[PDB]
């Protein structure tokens, strides 16, 4: 008795249930009018599936910065809840939001 | 019949020790590889070994 033999795997399979019940990011990014800074809005988002890729349709061009997280590995994480604060400021006060 | 039973029993025991933490984080080894860093993984692997 000299050797041992085992066949090796050749492929990888991952199976998960269907994707549905998407989070309402479209309502926040596209609406009638954004709130007024002193009186801003806070929306609580929970119990849904969030895909941070459809964002680019609603024009996040001028600025996109992410503290504490990574813009790519966002949908790879799970959180208890997420908030969305939206308002309107002048084009020169954006630097103050940090 | 007795002889046969004895042999069978032994085999089952040898299987059941596989699904045991043995004082480690978990019995599954691949999870210990995935979650943990090489410094702390070695002691767990040695413990299971």
């Amino acid at each position: 008795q000299t050797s041992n033999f085992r066949v090796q795997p050749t492929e990888s399979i991952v199976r998960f249930p269907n994707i549905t019940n998407l989070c309402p990011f479209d309502e926040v990014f596209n609406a009638t009018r954004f709130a007024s800074v002193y009186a801003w809005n806070r929306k609580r988002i929970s119990n849904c599936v969030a895909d941070y890729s459809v964002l680019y349709n609603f024009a996040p061009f001028f600025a996109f910065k992410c503290y504490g997280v990574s813009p790519t590995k966002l949908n790879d994480l799970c959180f208890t809840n997420v908030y969305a604060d939206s308002f309107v400021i002048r084009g020169n006060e954006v630097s103050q939001i940090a | 019949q007795n002889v046969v039973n004895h042999n069978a029993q032994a085999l089952n025991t040898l299987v059941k020790q596989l699904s045991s933490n043995f004082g480690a984080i978990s019995s599954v080894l691949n999870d210990i590889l995935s979650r943990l860093d090489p410094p702390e993984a070695e002691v767990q692997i040695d413990r299971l070994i």
Binding site: T2, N4, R15, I19, N47, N75, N81, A84, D85 | -
Partner: protein
Amino acid sequence: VVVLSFELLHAPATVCGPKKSTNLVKNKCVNFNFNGLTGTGVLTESNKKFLPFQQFGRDIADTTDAVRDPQTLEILDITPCSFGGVSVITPGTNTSNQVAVLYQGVNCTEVPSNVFQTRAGCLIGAEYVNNSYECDIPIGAGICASYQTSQSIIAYKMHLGAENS
């Protein structure tokens, strides 16, 4: 301006990203991950019938042997992939450098020339004659091997002894 705040509180995580799934392949030795259940083997069609809330099946030894596919709600049997011992049979280097190989406990069709299927396993490199002799090199389940005429490794059935009446 939109500001997003991510919170990890002490509660079950109910906001996650999408989890993509690949296709389903059968009759192959593959690694699989069914809804968090990770393993490897061969997936075949099952005849079992789970209850509507049950997701996978375990054996008497507490090993997973069946699984339900999350998208199409069918049952699949999980089977371990082939493994075994490899033994080498020789006439002795004083006689020849030819050898035969035994694969213990596998079919000759499972990814292993004269090939022969026995009860012990798959035998490669030997010729299976009929007429019997005394056992020379035991193989198992009544099969023995020898070096006979030109000269080659042959396999045969064990012969108990001369008939008398």
